């Protein structure tokens, strides 16, 4: 039977553009989702904009527009960037939605009646040296407007009631769940620092003015953005189930759920997804996630992204100059099971993509297709010129799937390009361009280029989750139904091809520099 898989990515904040560092997470997630879809599994990919908090109030104020105005414009822009980068969500919702308002309040109310909510007064005191108000830890709250000394009648001591999630109530459960396999060992041991220290109650309320959901029965008190943000996951899925009759909420979020749930996140936000989130789900009556998939961050030419050096590239700025599949492949070629950083070496970016994709994959196709087109009216002739070469492709497939399954895209691209390298070399060894000029060798020409195109179909199957647009164009040329992973098991013989679709041009280094220049501020 197929696997039911609900996959999410972190919800970007609704206060700025998506940049190429953010894009690494969504490309990682989308590629994994597309692979599971090819494998015949029910993989559902949901995300949303994170539209609350002082983060949004600051930008809304900085631009003289309302908070609703900003997040609406921003959600449109984020969805356009993701879509153009071929990141295909099943739903892209918003933490500022009626589903999130009800889910947050229903979860809160259940947790409260179970005794997992606490009320205590937080004190803030003015520090004359640091010249600002500090919180009573026993840091300051994030500012909501743009803005000190001890004034005569001005208080030096604020106080306000806050609402706490009694996270320590789940410490035993969390001590077990964090080491259950849901986290990679590196992740679990870095996270366990909070556990070694002892969990603390979590401040989930903010005072007015705050752009967010109001807390039931606490007038003037709002949920902190990080309280409702992960509930955006459930909200995004609940909103989707209204339009997808085959998707049942309880089937994915009930404690009994036999479905898998994965959160792709960056390493900076593990504590929210690994401590508060699974405690919240268990206390509220839902299943905990199957695993967190944690990733590192992006560097460009060996250094941190620089707005001054022009290596802090907006997704739209990339898309103005370059094919998105360039970057999708480059990321795939370095994305690993680990949690390390990933470097975009711009010179290596051009050499690697041109040599691997255009050179080893696209050119095997266009060269061979031309001979089938001109020499046999476009009918691919079936033959067995190089059985050992073909068997290698068969032997390699389940391993490439294992890499995909385990998020080891690096290994997967490696295995694929090794097959590409070997197939390409055999074609060159045959030299159909030379056989085509010899009289009485036309059968040989079609035998060779038939295998060539067959192997290109195999490479497209293997690369489809990285290059879904290229795959679509390839399926048009190959004149086949959309490719499943199981299609690798069959071959085209005696098959009418369509005209050759353009698949990918080389990366022009001028365009890469034009992208960097456009990003210098």
Q: Among residues 167, 229, 275, 335, which is the contact residue for ligand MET, using CB under 6 A? A: 229
Please name every residue paired with 19 in a beta bridge, in sequence order, or none if there are none: 314
Q: Among residues 50, 169, 408, 475, which is the contact residue for ligand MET, using CB under 6 A? A: 50
Instruction: Establish if 99 lies at the interface with ligand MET (CB under 6 A).
Output: no
Distance, in Å, from the CA atom of 413 to the CA atom of 504, rounded to the nearest integer, reads 17
Instruction: Establish if 230 lies at the interface with ligand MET (CB under 6 A).
Output: yes
With CB under 6 A, what is the number of residues at the site for ligand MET? 9
Q: Is the dihedral of CA 494, 500, 504, 508 positive or negative?
A: positive
Instruction: Establish if 269 lies at the interface with ligand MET (CB under 6 A).
Output: yes
Going along 34-188, which residue ranges are E strands? 42-49, 91-94, 117-127, 132-135, 157-165
- Closest CB 51 distance from ligand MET, rounded Å: 9
Nearer to ligand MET, 13 or 329 (CB): 13
- Closest CB 458 distance from ligand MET, rounded Å: 38
- Closest CB 232 distance from ligand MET, rounded Å: 6
Helix/strand/coil (H/E/C) assignment for every residue in 404-460:
HHCCCHHHHHHHHHHHHHHHHHHHHHHCHHHHCCCCCCHHHHHHHHHHHHHHHHHHH
Instruction: State how far Cα 336 lies from the chain centre.
Output: 14
Distance, in Å, from the CA atom of 361 to the CA atom of 354, rounded to the nearest integer, reads 10
Nearer to ligand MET, 14 or 33 (CB): 14
If you count DSSP H runs as helices and E runs as strands, how many of each does the chain have, helices first? 21, 15
- Closest CB 403 distance from ligand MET, rounded Å: 27
After which residues, if any, is the chain broken (C to N > 2.5 Å)?
138, 147
Q: Of 81-89, 158-166, 228-236, 311-319, which part binds ligand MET (CB under 6 A)?
A: 228-236
Instruction: Establish if 235 lies at the interface with ligand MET (CB under 6 A).
Output: no
Question: DSSP string of 200-253?
Answer: --EE-EEESS-SSPBPTT-TTEEE-HHHHTTHHHHHHHHHHHTT-TT--HHHHH
Residue where the block lists tokens 């604020």: 158
Instruction: Establish if 13 lies at the interface with ligand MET (CB under 6 A).
Output: yes
307 is annotated as contributing to ligand binding: yes
- Closest CB 264 distance from ligand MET, rounded Å: 10
- Closest CB 391 distance from ligand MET, rounded Å: 45
Instruction: Establish if 117 lies at the interface with ligand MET (CB under 6 A).
Output: no
Instruction: Establish if 278 lies at the interface with ligand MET (CB under 6 A).
Output: no
Inter-axis angle of helices 98-113 and 277-284, to 10 degrees?
A: 70
Q: Of 5-13, 131-139, 318-326, 431-439, which part binds ligand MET (CB under 6 A)?
A: 5-13
Q: CA of 457: how far to CAs of 273, 485, 499, in Å?
A: 40, 11, 15
Q: Among residues 5, 10, 240, 298, which is the contact residue for ligand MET, using CB under 6 A? A: 10
Nearer to ligand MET, 13 or 194 (CB): 13
Q: Of 163-171, 173-181, 226-234, 380-388, which part binds ligand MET (CB under 6 A)?
A: 226-234
Q: Which residues bind ligand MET (CB under 6 A)?
A: 10-13, 50, 229-230, 232, 269
């Amino acid at each position: 039977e197929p696997r039911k898989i609900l996959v999410t990515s972190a919800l970007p904040y609704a206060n700025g553009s998506i940049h190429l560092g953010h894009m690494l997470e969504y490309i990682q997630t989308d590629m994994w989702v597309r692979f599971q879809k090819m494998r015949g599994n029910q993989a559902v990919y949901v995300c949303a904009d994170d539209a609350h908090g002082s983060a949004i109030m600051l930008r809304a104020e900085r631009e003289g527009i309302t908070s609703e105005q900003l997040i609406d414009a921003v959600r449109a822009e984020h969805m356009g960037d993701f879509a153009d980068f071929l990141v295909d969500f099943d739903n892209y919702h918003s933490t500022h939605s009626e589903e999130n308002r009800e889910l947050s309040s229903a979860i809160y109310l259940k947790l409260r009646d179970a005794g997992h909510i606490d009320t205590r007064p937080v004190t803030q005191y003015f520090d004359p040296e640091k010249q600002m108000f500090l919180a009573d830890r026993f840091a300051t709250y994030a500012p909501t407007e743009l803005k000190s000394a001890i004034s005569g009648a001005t208080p030096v001591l604020k106080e306000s009631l806050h609402y706490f999630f009694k996270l320590p109530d789940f410490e035993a459960m969390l001590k077990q769940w964090t080491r259950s396999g849901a986290l990679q060992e590196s992740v679990a041991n870095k996270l366990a620092e909070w556990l070694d220290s002892g969990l603390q109650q979590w401040d989930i309320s903010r005072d007015a003015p705050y752009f967010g959901f109001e807390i039931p029965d606490a007038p003037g008190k709002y949920f902190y953005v990080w309280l409702d943000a992960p509930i955006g996951y459930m909200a995004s899925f609940k909103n989707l189930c209204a339009r997808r009759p085959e998707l049942d909420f309880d089937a994915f979020w009930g404690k009994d759920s036999g479905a898998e749930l994965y959160h792709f996140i960056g390493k900076d936000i593990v504590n929210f997804h690994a401590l508060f989130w699974p405690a919240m789900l268990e206390g509220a009556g839902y299943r905990k996630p199957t695993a967190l998939n944690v990733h590192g961050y992006l560097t460009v030419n060996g250094q941190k992204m620089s707005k001054s050096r022009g290596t802090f590239v907006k997704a739209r700025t990339y898309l103005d100059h370059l094919d998105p599949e360039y970057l999708r492949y480059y990321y795939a070629s370095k994305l690993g099971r680990g949690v390390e950083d990933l470097d975009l070496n711009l010179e290596d970016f051009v050499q690697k993509v041109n040599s691997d994709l255009v050179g080893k994959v696209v050119n095997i196709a266009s060269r061979c297709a031309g001979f089938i087109h001109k020499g046999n009216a476009g009918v691919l002739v079936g033959a067995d010129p190089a059985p050992e070469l073909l068997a290698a492709f068969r032997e390699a497939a389940p391993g490439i799937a294992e890499a995909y399954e385990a998020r080891d895209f690096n290994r997967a691209m490696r295995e694929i390009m090794a097959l590409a390298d070997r197939a390409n070399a055999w074609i060159a060894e045959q030299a159909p361009w030379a056989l085509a000029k010899q009289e009485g060798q036309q059968d040989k020409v079609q035998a060779v280029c038939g295998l060539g195109i067959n192997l290109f179909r195999q490479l497209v199957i293997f690369l489809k989750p990285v290059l879904p647009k290229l795959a679509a164009a390839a399926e048009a040329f190959l004149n086949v139904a959309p490719l499943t992973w199981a299609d690798h098991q069959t071959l085209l013989a005696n098959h009418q091809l369509n005209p050759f679709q353009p698949l990918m041009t080389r990366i022009e280094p001028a365009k890469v520099e034009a992208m960097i220049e456009a990003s210098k501020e």
